A paper describes a structure:
Nevertheless, the tri-Asp site in LarE represents an unusual metal binding site that selectively and stoichiometrically binds certain multivalent cations. In the apoprotein structure the tri-Asp site is pre-formed to receive a metal ion by a hydrogen bond network consisting of Asp231, Arg228, Gly207, and several water molecules filling the site. Notably, the arginine residues form a positively charged ring around the tri-Asp site, limiting the metal-Asp interactions along the three-fold symmetry axis and likely responsible for only one metal ion being captured by these residues. We observed binding to the tri-Asp site for Ca2+, Mn2+, both Fe2+ and Fe3+, Co2+, Ni2+, Cu2+, Zn2+, and Cd2+, whereas Mg2+, K+, Cr3+, Cu+ and Cs+ did not bind at that location (data not shown).
In all cases, the Asp231 side chains bind the metals with bidentate coordination, with a seventh site always showing extra density that we modelled as a water molecule. Nevertheless, the best interpretation of electron density is always a seven-coordinated metal atom consistent across all observed elements. For small molecule complexes in the Cambridge Structural Database (CSD) the most common and second most frequent coordination numbers for Mn2+, Fe2+/3+, Co2+, Ni2+, Zn2+, and Cd2+ are 6 and 4; while for Ca2+ they are 6 and 7; and for Cu2+ they are 5 and 635. The results show a similar picture for these elements with the most frequent coordination number being 6 for Mn, Fe, Co, and Ni; 7 (closely followed by 6) for Ca; and 4 for Cu, Zn, and Cd (with 6 coordination being less frequently observed). Interestingly, when carboxyl groups are involved in chelating Zn2+ or Cd2+ in protein structures, 7 coordination (as observed in LarE) is actually the most frequently observed coordination. Several metal soaks (Co, Ni, Zn, and Cd) also resulted in binding of these metals to surface exposed residues. These partially disordered sites only appeared after metal soaks, showing a significant electron density peak and in some cases anomalous peaks. In most cases the surface site involved only a single histidine residue. This resulted in higher B-factors of these metals compared to the tri-Asp site. We reason that the tri-Asp site captures low levels of contaminating metal ions, most likely Ni, Co, or Cd, from the Superdex 200 resin used for other protein purifications in the laboratory.
Numbering used by the authors:
A (entry chain E): 2 to 126, 144 to 259
B (entry chain D): 2 to 125, 144 to 259
C (entry chain F): 2 to 126, 138 to 260
D (entry chain C): 2 to 126, 136 to 259
E (entry chain A): 2 to 125, 134 to 171, 176 to 259
F (entry chain B): 2 to 127, 141 to 259
Amino acid sequence: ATLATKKATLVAALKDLQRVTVAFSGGIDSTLVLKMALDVLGRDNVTAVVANSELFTDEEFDKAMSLAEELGANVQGTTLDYLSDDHIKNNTPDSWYYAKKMFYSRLNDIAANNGSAAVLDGMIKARSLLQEADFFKTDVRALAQELGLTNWNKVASCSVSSRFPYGTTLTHDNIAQVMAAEKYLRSLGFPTVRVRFHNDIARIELPEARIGDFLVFNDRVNRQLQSLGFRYVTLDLGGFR
Amino acid sequence: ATLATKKATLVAALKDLQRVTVAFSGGIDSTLVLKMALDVLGRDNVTAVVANSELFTDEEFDKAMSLAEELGANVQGTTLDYLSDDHIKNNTPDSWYYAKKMFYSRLNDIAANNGSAAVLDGMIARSLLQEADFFKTDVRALAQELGLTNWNKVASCSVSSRFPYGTTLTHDNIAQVMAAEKYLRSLGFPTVRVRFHNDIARIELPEARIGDFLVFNDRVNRQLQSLGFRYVTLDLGGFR
Amino acid sequence: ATLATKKATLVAALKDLQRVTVAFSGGIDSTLVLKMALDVLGRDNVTAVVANSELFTDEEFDKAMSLAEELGANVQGTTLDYLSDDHIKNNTPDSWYYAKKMFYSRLNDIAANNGSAAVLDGMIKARSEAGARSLLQEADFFKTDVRALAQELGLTNWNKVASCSVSSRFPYGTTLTHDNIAQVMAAEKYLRSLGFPTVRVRFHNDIARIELPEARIGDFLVFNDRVNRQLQSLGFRYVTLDLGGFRS
Amino acid sequence: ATLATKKATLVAALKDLQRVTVAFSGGIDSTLVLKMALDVLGRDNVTAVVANSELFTDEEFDKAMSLAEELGANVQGTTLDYLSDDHIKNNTPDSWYYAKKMFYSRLNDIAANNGSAAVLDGMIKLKARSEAGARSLLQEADFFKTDVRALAQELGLTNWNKVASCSVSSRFPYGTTLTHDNIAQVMAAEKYLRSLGFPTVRVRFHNDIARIELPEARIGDFLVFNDRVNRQLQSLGFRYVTLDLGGFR
Amino acid sequence: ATLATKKATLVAALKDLQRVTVAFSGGIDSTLVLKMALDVLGRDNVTAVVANSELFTDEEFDKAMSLAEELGANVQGTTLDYLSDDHIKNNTPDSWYYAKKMFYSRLNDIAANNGSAAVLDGMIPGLKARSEAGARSLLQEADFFKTDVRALAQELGLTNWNCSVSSRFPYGTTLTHDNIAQVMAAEKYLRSLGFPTVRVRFHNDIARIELPEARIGDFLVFNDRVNRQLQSLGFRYVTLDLGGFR
Amino acid sequence: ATLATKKATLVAALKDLQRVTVAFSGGIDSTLVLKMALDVLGRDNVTAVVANSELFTDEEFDKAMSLAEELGANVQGTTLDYLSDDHIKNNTPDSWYYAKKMFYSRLNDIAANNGSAAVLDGMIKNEAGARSLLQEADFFKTDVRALAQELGLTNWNKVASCSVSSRFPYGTTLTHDNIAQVMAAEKYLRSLGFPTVRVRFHNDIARIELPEARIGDFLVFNDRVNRQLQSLGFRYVTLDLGGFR
């Protein structure tokens, strides 16, 4: 289809819902949904909710809260303690299962309190309207460009649980350790980076085309990540993913 | 804290001034102010001013003069002789102050003489984008809304910072430093300083670009030597 | 002299033509012509045409078609077989000319069959021989006038990077075939997917001569072996990197 | 004393022994002992023995066998199963002692079966050697490292192992149990890395993690090989293949 | 059996020929043959010959000539025009054979004119190039392995010892005096920048540089100088093989 | 001439001198001279002299003293005060001349007092109180380690010592402090794996010259070298884009 046909399904789907609460993370997808809902449904009939968790950075939470205000939405912060579930706290392979299970249960209850007909997320190809309207990665960038949206989270980052091996118990300490390492690495000019936690070993994942540029920082990163508690600081030769 | 609320603040403030003179550098901030001023006050009530100076590049001047005309403004070039002032010519730690005073005094005289209510600049003189609480994100959202895509993106700094305190700035050693930085930028290094130390050139690059730079060592060495440096070096501390 | 007089010359030229066919590449210039043509003459009186050929990417074609639909134009792709012309098939130094004569004759025939008064291209200040109009050139548009009017019409999206014919990857006198062209484009596509958007894979039979911007060559080294084996499996015997860098 | 007096002490000790078996590693010290032994007692009365084990690389074994023959000695390889001793298999700080103990007793049996009066090693100015009865003639004659370099030049000796081979056990943390499998894993990984042009390298074993140590001044050169090293070491059984940012130690 | 029995066959064979001409390259193999012949037959009955050709560098020749003088042989250079033979000039896959045929014919012509009983080399499309010449490889007849030659080189006290440029050209490409000088100048320039192991493969207007992969990072600082130098030697395009040397 | 004849000229020339004093730096040329002198005249009539000075490192001096003993020589250290001469102290373009005059004048006094017939150095092909026997016998660089390998010689200083004067511009006054500064910087750089290096002194700027083929390898050390040379007193630490020499 044309982008206009997919955009029309999205307006038509939204009018049919009349009042929605939209799970807003700040990535390009959720920024498109949040804006489309505000444009078809009005400020007072769309609720943006930003999840606060121990698994995400305060900066990503703060950036989404600020773009939702910048977009003109009533946005509400709700804080989730993902670590209360021992399936998640011990990061067993089902651990995504309960994390999504907790995210949507908080989101479903919020919709009852402001009278929305459904809560929307930003999944592409709970209702995920961009997938129902058959939006692909190229379609989402095209519509956002047409809607004048310029600011969104270019740092498509993930819950910090993905840095830990299955069976490792998450702690306030080792999560902060992983996140302080990634924040330090990003401050040197590597916006895409993972610091995988392996007890005494830190395993750094960088995009392969950035590894040559990284070499000037080896010693400072080595000494900095050792001061955060790692005994050995290493670079994955496989790169990011 | 909506963009629509800040844009109304900026429109309202511009309506209260009626006739404005805009300090126009050509960056996104000053280009946003110049269009907003044209859209609410009209061509005949806005004067765009572009400083022609020895401390900034002719490329920055030519691009700004053309971008003001392209946006639909009446544009005026004014030329500042910063080196006639001995505080700037001798590069003291206070020279920035005298340079800013000479610049804002010329802009005040133009605005007084064309009947403007204020001089405007792009800071985030009135800085209305700062008064309306525009952030870098707000400014990119409004420029897209006005259909503005074209502006200079090479961040501009006075060439004074390339010289040690106590150094006498001259037309020749300024031209030397600027030809060197223009050459380096043309190789693909948009953020670069050639600090001047008489017979030594001290190059600052972002540390993450120094590996990429090595394929050019010999050409940079020979080019900056032909520009008058005897030794061409790379600071191991990098940019800053 | 002023933009407003230049915009009026263009409006008048379009009103006089009443019905037009637009050669649409997706760049800023043809995007401005198509937008003005749609605003002045209406959707049913404008046909946007995007050429599909073996000498350009299927990506480039898909994006140009999508840019014309996004503007609100009825757009039709036409398919050109440039290799049927022996100046192009044998990559003579004048082959660009025969490619454009063939392109403009197809556009003239499309215009004849839908009732347009002219074919419009986006040239500014072999088309003289087919009768294409460059209304921006006639109205004295320079690059800054195009950027000014596009911003006053709210146009922000277009192709920022011009397309070059894959003919430029082959030495003069080399015979282009559906097979070796597919080789050059698959090699360049693989390279772009590793993070090198500006690249050329020059064809010298058993040798691929890769052109990269010199500032990226340090970044490229982590890929030497994968590029070597990938381009060999595409049919090259030797995979090399030009020491002069991109366009030397 | 003088180099000449020390050289005469060494000559005298060898003539009194008549027939010797020489523990030959290829380093400068055992190379001096073997050369002196051949110069004083002749090819027919000297047996050079080179230990082959799974704790040292096959490349070093072949190089020592060739350095011994090139010097003119009858040279014999013996194979040691160091993992048969559990003091060695359990990677304790005294495991080196039991490895030397097993090596010196095999040399004693070889010495008994070829009629030698002593086993000679190349030690200069400790308890496994002395328990076994091996003699260190350079130490008895009071050779220091400079004396060994002096007499080596006098005899025209130029070729020897500059690299000192270390046991693969140092790639494993203390208390990690050595196995035929994890040793072969570490040794094949290092062998591939050396074959790319990196003679000084360690692959430290961390179960599913391989931690590569290279001299920092070579890490820039290594970049062209990351992807092949990753897949090669993954095919050897490591899940993760990493480069230590600290370099070689 | 033992090394002493293997060198014993070589003593006997050398004693029976009395006067020999020795094809001398300077590698470990030919230096042992030349030293054995001098020790068994004496200086006045041994002629060492070193081939000088356009397909090798004047340094390879100069190093080989000294090697034989230091061994104690009377040494003689002969110069061959390998490009006169069209198997070699057109770089067919067998031209190594025809180069050795021309070499052994010149050496047989040298040996007949000084009266040697045979031509000796250091070895361990038609008839084998030696057998067709009559050349003996005495180290091969004595069943020498690479260890025996390294062993025997030390029992006689040997201390000093040591590729055709055709391998820079594709099969079917015509060798000329000029493109040979071009390739040889290009490799000398690269070696002088610190790359002792290097090949400049000639592909007409394209130079394809082969380097050990572990040196390509070090090479980048030289790209532009190498590009312009090899262009000035006559190449239009100067490239680096991503597969590296070998 | 053949290498064997050049060796005979050297043997004959050494036998005609009977007792020699050898200027010994530890490089290949002077170790070849020192070895030939011992092999032809015997230890008791060869005196090896190693100059200790502020313009060369203590590390090269100790290595040279120990290499002479390893060669079989009686070795004697002598101390030179190069900075006592004002051409050297003020780094005039003349200073090489006064440094060589002071070096050879000291060696001649040692030679006179131990009864040697000549002072020997290791100069080759391509002072008047010095014989360079390798030069008289027409030895080239190829001849020297052809012959050095025939004597089995392996240990010698493989990177060339140069006077620290070349790290300072002509006209700069050399002092104990700025020499110590340059010498601690080059020693640090060598300790990271860069045996061939110059730290050129330009007051508050250090200009590091490295062989161009090593500059890619050096990037992993930029920050450590920057901080180390700053702690030695340099304000700016830079890398010459032209590389070494």
